[PDB]
Amino acid sequence: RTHPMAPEKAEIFNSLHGWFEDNILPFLKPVEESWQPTDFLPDSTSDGFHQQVEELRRRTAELPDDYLVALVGAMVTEEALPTYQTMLNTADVVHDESGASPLPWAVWTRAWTAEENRHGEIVNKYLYLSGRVDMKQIEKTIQYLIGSGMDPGTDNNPYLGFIYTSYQERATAISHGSLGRLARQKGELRLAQICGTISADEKRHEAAYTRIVEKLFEMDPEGTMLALEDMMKKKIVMPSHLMHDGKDPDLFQHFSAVSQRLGIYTAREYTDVLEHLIARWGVDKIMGLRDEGRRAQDYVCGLPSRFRRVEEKAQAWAEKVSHVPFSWVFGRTV
Amino acid sequence: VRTHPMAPEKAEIFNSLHGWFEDNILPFLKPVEESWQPTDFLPDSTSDGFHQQVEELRRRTAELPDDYLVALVGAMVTEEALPTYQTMLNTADVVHDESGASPLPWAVWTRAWTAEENRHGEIVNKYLYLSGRVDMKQIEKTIQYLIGSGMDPGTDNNPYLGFIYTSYQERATAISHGSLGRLARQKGELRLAQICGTISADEKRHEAAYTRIVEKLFEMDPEGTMLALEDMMKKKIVMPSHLMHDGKDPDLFQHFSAVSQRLGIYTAREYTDVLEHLIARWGVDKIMGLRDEGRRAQDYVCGLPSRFRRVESHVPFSWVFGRTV
Numbered sequence A: 001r002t003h004p005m006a007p008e009k010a011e012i013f014n015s016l017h018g019w020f021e022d023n024i025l026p027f028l029k030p031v032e033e034s035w036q037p038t039d040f041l042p043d044s045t046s047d048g049f050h051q052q053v054e055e056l057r058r059r060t061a062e063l064p065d066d067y068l069v070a071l072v073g074a075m076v077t078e079e080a081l082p083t084y085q086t087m088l089n090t091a092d093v094v095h096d097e098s099g100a101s102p103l104p105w106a107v108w109t110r111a112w113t114a115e116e117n118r119h120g121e122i123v124n125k126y127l128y129l130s131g132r133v134d135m136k137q138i139e140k141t142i143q144y145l146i147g148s149g150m151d152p153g154t155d156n157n158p159y160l161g162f163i164y165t166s167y168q169e170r171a172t173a174i175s176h177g178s179l180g181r182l183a184r185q186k187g188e189l190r191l192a193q194i195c196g197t198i199s200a201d202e203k204r205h206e207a208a209y210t211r212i213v214e215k216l217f218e219m220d221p222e223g224t225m226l227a228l229e230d231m232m233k234k235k236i237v238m239p240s241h242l243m244h245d246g247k248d249p250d251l252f253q254h255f256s257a258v259s260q261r262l263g264i265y266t267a268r269e270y271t272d273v274l275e276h277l278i279a280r281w282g283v284d285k286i287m288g289l290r291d292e293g294r295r296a297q298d299y300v301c302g303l304p305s306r307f308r309r310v311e312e313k314a315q316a317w318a319e320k321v322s323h324v325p326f327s328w329v330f331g332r333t334v
Numbered sequence B: 001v002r003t004h005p006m007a008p009e010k011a012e013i014f015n016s017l018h019g020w021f022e023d024n025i026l027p028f029l030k031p032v033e034e035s036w037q038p039t040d041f042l043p044d045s046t047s048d049g050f051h052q053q054v055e056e057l058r059r060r061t062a063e064l065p066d067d068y069l070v071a072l073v074g075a076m077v078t079e080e081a082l083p084t085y086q087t088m089l090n091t092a093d094v095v096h097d098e099s100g101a102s103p104l105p106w107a108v109w110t111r112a113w114t115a116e117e118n119r120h121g122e123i124v125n126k127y128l129y130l131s132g133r134v135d136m137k138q139i140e141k142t143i144q145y146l147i148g149s150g151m152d153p154g155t156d157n158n159p160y161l162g163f164i165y166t167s168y169q170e171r172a173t174a175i176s177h178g179s180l181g182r183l184a185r186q187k188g189e190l191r192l193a194q195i196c197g198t199i200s201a202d203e204k205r206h207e208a209a210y211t212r213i214v215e216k217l218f219e220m221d222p223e224g225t226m227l228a229l230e231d232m233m234k235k236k237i238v239m240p241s242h243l244m245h246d247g248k249d250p251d252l253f254q255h256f257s258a259v260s261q262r263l264g265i266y267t268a269r270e271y272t273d274v275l276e277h278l279i280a281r282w283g284v285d286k287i288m289g290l291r292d293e294g295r296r297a298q299d300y301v302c303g304l305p306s307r308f309r310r311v312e313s314h315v316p317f318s319w320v321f322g323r324t325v
Ligand SMILES: [Fe+2]
Pocket: A078, A116, A119, A172, A202
């Protein structure tokens, strides 16, 4: 671990229980008011169930393979949810000590996980009914991914975990948002509504974790700045970066290329998230830092300009697109 | 309040079992390429007979009574709260997954065990969806409530208690799905009977692994493991989904448990059967190297089956569209 949390910082999180209840918990959507996968699937209690399923298969029959790979990979990432609640519960002090702790930090993690459980569920059933993808190869991919876990480099530090999740929540909101807009272009409005509804959930989660880091910047500007530098040096990795389907050892890299080729969370948008978080957290305006925090502040604020220069060179000399087989789509070359 | 936390010096026991765990516990995992998947038991959506396979599924499930549906749904909802269970395993001291992808054998098992668990709720959820016999939205509300509530089995972050609890509950879930499969076969629903029986076989592998872990703990630390067994049995082995509710019935778990036990699915008699099996399986009455405290704990645990033998309403369910079960 390169950046473990100092033990005395426990007093910061232990003093925020009342603040967390008033400011972070309201970002949760009440269960009785929340959408469920049933709302977007054919009604199995209706006499027209078979007709509704057939209409689903017709509207999905024209989805190209490259969109299917991008959609499946995002769903596979969502389906590895048990790894994500475990990751949140690796953070010191704020983790769920008993599995049902009434502390506000643990109440959020369980309720956040409960909201997350519906995201992979709706797309999985939708893709199952579509018949357009090899569900067994996808289910093997999910089993491999959960067994592999993830390594975001958070070092059991809630500072790093909340910064990482703030980054990935916006990334996942952009991803599901782009997946819905691409579905809309292909005439598939229901899946567009599904992806847009999932994206709206991620925006609420983004605002909550972003508010947590904002509070940490207020109470500990030095610690949070050093944590932000450490996460950006490690880079924000996608939680499903160890995915493989038992056929392609480089499944994640190949899926990522297809997803970014379609405009779903490109490298340019990775930099857009950093610029937004810099402006939202006011990283360039934080005062009262020491020399170590000042170097971290200058490092983070200098990253956007360096990233744009890499993107300009990639715009002129881009690598040729390679097409590779995907077991998700029955081994066809995508 | 933790009543039985693990002594810090017990860490050396688990740290000495990394090689033993790889050689003896990890082989209980089923390789992914050899593992069944929900697709194997569901209508093939890539086939031309997809609609016919779905309709045949609905025909076999059209006669399932409400009491069996409630028992089956409640077992599926328990399976769907999987993210709570991997967190529970990672609350144990020393043996938890510190980084989420740790190569330590204890963490390799936990992630792979969770991966196997993910298919159990998945197959029954999709099967019940296609059946059209149950209110899927009320079930999805129940799952969201359950994950948000979590669970508290009283393991006190103690791997001794966690492995004893899981050994107990793994057998309970294997028996539960076994009875659900036997009842499905009686009603002519053969496919679901194979599904519940295949899930039960997964739990038997998990039971044997955690049972093997506790057996090793009895060998290396008979006093500590005996004291842990007494503490868990005093706390009672609670079902992981004991905090379930559907936003309609605050007593959903008690009402679901009554329906499930009325049908013969993991009755109070079978709760005692698990204890008696674990007593004989672990050789609790013959364990060596005990002190005065462990012998007193041993006399309590081995006396419980006799105490349990002497100890041995219809309500609406939103799962079945509010009908009285
Ligand atoms: Fe999500």
